[PDB]
Every structure is written in structure tokens, then in C-alpha cells.
Curated annotation (Swiss-Prot):
Keyword Nucleotide-binding tagged: yes
Short sequence motif named RXXXR motif, residue ranges: 9-13
Source organism phylogeny: Bacteria, Pseudomonadati, Pseudomonadota, Gammaproteobacteria, Pseudomonadales
SUPFAM superfamilies given in the database record: PilZ domain-like
The protein's name: Cyclic diguanosine monophosphate-binding protein PA4608
Binding site for 3',3'-c-di-GMP: D6, E7, R8, R9, R10, F11, H12, R13, W77
Domain comment (free text): Consists of a six-stranded anti-parallel beta-barrel core structure with an unstructured N-terminus in apo-form and a C-terminal alpha helix. In the holo-form the C-terminal helix is displaced by the ligand, thereby opening one side of the beta-barrel as a binding site, and the N-terminus containing the RXXXR motif wraps around the ligand and in turn ties the C-terminal helix in a loose conformation. The structural rearrangement upon ligand binding creates a significant change in surface charge distribution.
Its job: Binds the second messenger bis-(3'-5') cyclic dimeric guanosine monophosphate (c-di-GMP). Can bind two c-di-GMP molecules per monomer. May play a role in bacterial second-messenger regulated processes. Binding to c-di-GMP induces a conformational change of the C- and N-termini resulting in the exposure of a highly negative surface on one side of the protein to a possible effector protein.
Length: 125
């Protein structure tokens, strides 16, 4: 249709204003999303929980009350407050929302096609 639509630039980075809850059935930990992809997700926790890669975690992204993104993940590595999870089961409809949002903003699906070790926070040292 057209690119020029916003005064700003649509997020060309994977970080949305969504309620990100990483839970495990009974235990909920609200967290801030830094970048999420098809291979994994990097969040930032200013509070350390248990920290066990043997414990699979649930990533529930409330993009809206009616717009729920869901994905079953496992803790791959936790380091310096940055926790990189590996994706196990992202729901088809969930992916449909995620990819559609990227498409909508024209953020390039390239971001989803990196490797978890390549996914760093907005600030790099």
C-alpha cells in the first residue's frame, strides 16, 4: 500500500508494548521483553528467580486483551540480568499474530531469522 504513514518509524526492532508474563503454571513472573523471535526470546529481569534450564517456562504476551500471543519456551541461559530462552512450541495463531505485526510495521522478518547468540539487548557493550 504505502510505507510513509507515520511521523515516527514503525518499530524495526522486536519490542512491543505488551504485558509479558513468564510463568510456570502456579508461579508468575512479569518481565520486560527486549527481543523475541522464532528461535528464542531475550528478556531482561531486574530480579532473579530460580534459574534452572531444566525448568520449561511459559511466555504469555498480552499485546491486547483480545490479542494474546503465547509460546512455550525453555530457559537456555541467564546472564547478567539478560535471560535468553529457546523456543519450543509457538502456537500457529500466535505466530500468525507475531509475523503479521512485523509485516504491518515492515520491521523485516530478518529479525526473526537471527540466532539466539546474536540476539543482544538494545544496548551493546
Amino acid at each position: 500500500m504505502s510505507d510513509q504513514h507515520d511521523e515516527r518509524r514503525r518499530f524495526h526492532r522486536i519490542a512491543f508494548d505488551a504485558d509479558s508474563e513468564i510463568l510456570q503454571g502456579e508461579r508468575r513472573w512479569e518481565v520486560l521483553l527486549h527481543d523475541v523471535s522464532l528461535h528464542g526470546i531475550l528478556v531482561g529481569q531486574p530480579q532473579d528467580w530460580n534459574g534452572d534450564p531444566q525448568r520449561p517456562f511459559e511466555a504469555r504476551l498480552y499485546l491486547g486483551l483480545d490479542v494474546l500471543i503465547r509460546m512455550e519456551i525453555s530457559l537456555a541461559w541467564a546472564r547478567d540480568g539478560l535471560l535468553g530462552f529457546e523456543c519450543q512450541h509457538i502456537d500457529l495463531d500466535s505466530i500468525s499474530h507475531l509475523r503479521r505485526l512485523v509485516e504491518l510495521n515492515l520491521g523485516d522478518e530478518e529479525l526473526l531469522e537471527r540466532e539466539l547468540a546474536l540476539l543482544v539487548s538494545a544496548h551493546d557493550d
